[PDB]
Design a protein around this ligand. Structure first.
Ligand code: AGS
Ligand code: MG
Ligand code: ZN
Ligand code: ZN
Lengths: 105, 121, 124, 396, 111
């Protein structure tokens, strides 16, 4: 099977994390000004330049990350080779491969 | 007794060892006699290990890794042990019966000893 | 060449003799054979009876400030808490008492023979 | 004359008069497919009868006000003749701001408040400052406190002295109610049925069934079982808005193991999501956020501060925000902080009866004080000095 | 109860310590992130691609039960929780706990 490089996995993780901040998943039912990144770039906010938004971010946790199954949520001893997703059972591996491994269905 | 959060020998040789033990009821900072550093190094005690230290003898036993670190690797040959529940400092007044034969056999042969003759014995 | 025998047993069996420190007494107070080659008759008979620490001296040294730095050779309270300080001083008192009791316990025994006797009696 | 207290949150605006009670109203506009040309504003969401597929127009992105038109419309509705009939020219306004609010947002706030409405005086503070003031009023003997504001879009942890905010030790955790609701939506959509368009219903489900577990792996093992022993698993009947107006949990005696029900109710079965979703607050790395959780962040924030003040801060942990209403949240926070705290230091975590309205009560209390007039910035002084003195007086 | 990992080795990588190990059954395949002790255990007992091995997770006990292309690759789950029952005689307990390396006396007399 194919293998996804580190950049692809990091992009997928970032996209999944950003999707959790989305206001709505659908479009405007009517169907017919800035954003946070524009505000950050306009502030010209530099690290170590006093207390600010960036310096207030929580640091890395000391306790290691606990793996959970991407399908059912129970703890997952196994890591998928192709995409790096965690899984816990043959059925869960098959479901993950059918649904979200490689191509994002 | 507790999980080790810090293990820092203090140089003048080493004057003392500062250790940090964590339990469910809090954290305690302990200053150890420098002779205990050899025992800590023999037991291979690092941060995140659950150990106990006998106050009267300085004996150190590393009784596994804390189970909070069980997920730091997917496959390690480690024995993961729960974090101790009580206080870091545990006091118990006990009454134990021994016989004179126990003291005789305890003093019949030497124990420990880093010399070659002791090891071969 | 044969592979070794892999003898498998219950993990509980290997802990049968193990006793928790809170469940056993210190047997080092009866360790006579361990003192041989390490403790001398001088230490047991002349030095320790004269230079044993006392609780008064231990408390005085602990409470006294740090000694002045050794001279170089010459070629010739808003955030104060009363309960926390009471707990801390009780802990310090307990630590000093433990230090005293352990120092007394670890030098109570006198050698059966001693280093001097063994050295004298040991021919080349 | 009168004073208006407003907590311009990203989810709920705590707006009320100083002499009256407190009202919780969503601070966002709504649109639905049952109305062709009709935009609901603020509390008008009660009028709609089929909130399924509801579209949200929010004025806050990532906890900061970024959309000005919807916020202006919401304020005009709240300040209009229908809601409160605020007399702008003779009223003082206490309005809350996110921590470390950007300079542009502060300038726009000052301009809008002092020109578009022409308020007599404005006091812009942080919700944590009001919470700290209320806490110090309730407990006069305490000299230092730490506020945990687990809200809709983030969770800040800020330590406060008697009359100052320690800006150096402010720590932000990027986990809030929005993130938890979206994660629950994603889990349910991936596992049982597609609910990504049902934000309202999934949020109500989270508020009704989710809880914080004292033993995570024991609960996981219990949930993994099948049969009577699976005490964690419950059955929820989603509201169809035809005969079931609001969602409810089926009684345990009425549960069916097979999962098939003669009634055609759309039943959503949640077993491990009950405590997996709240756990993201304590373990952000569970879902993929490399940030310290609430207890570790509290301990870190306290330990950044000088040693002398640490025992006082450890004694005055306060939980505020909507996410703090999870069952077992206070106990879990206390247990973890006690595990991390030095044993000589006592730990006390206080959860008020209404963590939503804590900041509003603090604002009401600070309005009644005799030092209130010195804190605010007047319009007459605004004309000349405003643009500097708004930044000078407000400790944002 | 013990956790036992039985499968066919696909790829073993060790770099100057960190390492990765990929194991497969006839139904599933997985990549493991290895710790220092397991890396040492896998280095001590020469393991190469194609070998069918079982690992005791808590101890690092690796026993090679053949090579496959000779034993068929395992079928079910890679990681299995097994209940192991041992009946140990009182004499065996006494001999094991009599001295260090005392279990040897169960085979060579010398009690
Ligand atoms: N009983 C409940 N159980 C769980 N979550 C709840 C409950 N009640 C309310 N919430 C959530 O609490 C969040 C709202 O919290 P608020 O304190 O009002 O946030 P906020 O003040 O707007 O946030 P900021 O950061 O201060 S702008 C929403 O995500 C609600 O879904
Ligand atoms: Mg708020
Ligand atoms: Zn699974
Ligand atoms: Zn995959």
């Amino acid at each position: 099977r194919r293998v996804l490089d580190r950049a692809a996995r990091q992009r997928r993780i970032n996209r999944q994390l950003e999707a959790l901040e989305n206001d709505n998943f659908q479009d405007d039912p009517h169907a017919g000004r800035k954003n946070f990144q524009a505000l950050l770039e306009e502030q010209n906010l530099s690290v170590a330049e006093g207390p600010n938004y960036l310096t207030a971010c929580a640091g890395p946790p000391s306790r290691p990350q606990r793996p959970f199954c991407a399908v059912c949520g129970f703890p997952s001893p196994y890591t998928c080779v192709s995409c790096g997703a965690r899984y816990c059972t043959v059925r869960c591996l098959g479901t993950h491969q059918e649904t979200r491994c490689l191509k994002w269905t | 007794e507790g999980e080790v959060t810090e293990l820092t020998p203090c140089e003048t040789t080493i004057s003392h060892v500062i250790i940090g033990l964590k339990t469910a009821k809090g954290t305690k900072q302990l200053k150890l006699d420098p002779s205990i550093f050899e025992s800590l190094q023999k037991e291979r005690v690092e941060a995140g290990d659950v150990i106990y230290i006998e106050a009267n003898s300085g004996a150190v036993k590393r009784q596994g890794r804390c189970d909070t670190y069980a997920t730091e690797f997917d496959l390690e040959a480690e024995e993961y042990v729960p974090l101790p529940k009580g206080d870091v400092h545990k006091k118990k007044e006990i009454i134990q019966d021994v016989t004179l034969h126990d003291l005789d056999v305890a003093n019949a042969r030497p124990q420990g000893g880093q010399d070659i003759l002791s090891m071969m014995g | 060449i044969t592979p070794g025998i892999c003898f498998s047993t219950a993990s509980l069996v290997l802990r049968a003799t193990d006793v928790h420190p809170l469940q056993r007494i210190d047997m080092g107070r009866f360790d006579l054979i361990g003192l041989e080659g390490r403790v001398s008759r001088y230490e047991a008979d002349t030095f320790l009876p004269r230079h044993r620490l006392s609780r008064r001296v231990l408390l005085e040294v602990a409470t006294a400030p740090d000694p002045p730095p050794r001279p170089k050779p010459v070629k010739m309270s808003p955030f104060y808490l009363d309960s926390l300080e009471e707990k801390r001083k009780r802990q310090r008192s307990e630590r000093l008492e433990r230090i005293f009791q352990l120092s007394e316990a670890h030098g109570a025994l006198a050698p059966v023979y001693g280093t001097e006797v063994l050295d004298f009696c040991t021919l080349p | 004359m009168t004073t208006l207290v407003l907590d311009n949150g990203a989810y709920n605006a705590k707006i009320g008069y100083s002499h009256e009670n407190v009202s919780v109203i969503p601070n966002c506009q709504f649109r639905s497919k049952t109305a062709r040309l009709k935009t609901f504003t603020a509390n008008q969401i009660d009028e709609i009868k089929d909130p399924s597929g509801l579209f949200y127009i929010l004025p806050f992105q990532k906890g900061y006000l970024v959309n000005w038109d919807v916020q202006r419309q919401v304020w005009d509705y709240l300040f209009g003749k229908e809601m409160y009939q605020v007399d702008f020219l003779d009223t003082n306004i206490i309005i809350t701001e996110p921590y470390f609010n950007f300079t542009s947002i502060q300038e726009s706030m000052n301009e809008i408040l002092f020109e578009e409405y022409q308020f007599q005086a404005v006091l812009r503070v942080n919700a944590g400052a009001l919470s700290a003031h209320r806490y110090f009023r309730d407990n006069p003997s305490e000299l230092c406190c730490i506020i945990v504001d687990s809200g809709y879009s983030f969770t800040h942890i800020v330590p406060y002295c008697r009359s100052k905010k320690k800006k150096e030790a402010i720590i932000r955790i990027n986990v809030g109610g929005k993130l938890l609701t979206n994660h629950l939506k994603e889990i349910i959509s991936y596992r049982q049925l597609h609910v990504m368009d049902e934000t309202h219903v999934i949020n109500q489900v989270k508020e009704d069934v989710c809880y914080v577990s004292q033993d995570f792996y024991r609960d996981m093992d219990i949930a993994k079982l099948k049969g009577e022993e699976n005490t964690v698993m419950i059955d929820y009947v989603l509201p169809d808005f035809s005969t079931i107006k609001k969602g409810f949990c089926k009684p345990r005696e009425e549960m069916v193991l097979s999962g098939k029900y003669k009634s055609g109710e759309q039943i959503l079965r949640l077993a491990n999501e009950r405590f997996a979703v709240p756990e993201i607050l304590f373990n952000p790395s569970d879902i993929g956020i490399q940030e310290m959780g609430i207890p570790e962040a509290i301990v870190y924030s306290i330990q950044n501060l000088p040693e002398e003040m640490q025992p006082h801060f450890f004694k005055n942990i306060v939980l505020t925000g909507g996410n703090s209403l999870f069952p077992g949240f206070r106990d879990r926070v206390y247990s973890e902080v006690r595990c991390l705290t030095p044993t000589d230091y006592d730990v006390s975590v206080v959860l008020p009866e209404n963590p939503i309205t804590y900041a509003w009560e603090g604002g009401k209390l600070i309005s009644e004080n005799d030092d209130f007039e010195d804190m605010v910035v007047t319009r007459e002084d605004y004309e000349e000095n405003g643009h500097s003195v708004c930044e000078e007086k407000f400790d944002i | 109860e013990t956790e036992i990992i039985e499968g066919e080795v696909v790829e073993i990588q060790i770099d100057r310590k960190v390492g990765k190990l990929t194991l497969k059954t006839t139904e599933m395949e997985t990549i493991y992130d290895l710790g220092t002790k397991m890396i040492e255990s896998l280095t001590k007992d020469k393991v190469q691609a194609g070998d069918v091995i079982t690992i005791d997770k808590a101890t690092g006990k690796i026993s090679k039960l053949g090579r496959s292309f000779f034993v068929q690759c395992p079928d079910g789950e890679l990681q299995k929780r097994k209940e192991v029952v041992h009946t140990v005689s009182l004499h065996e307990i006494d001999v094991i706990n009599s001295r260090t390396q005392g279990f040897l006396a169960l085979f060579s007399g010398d009690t």
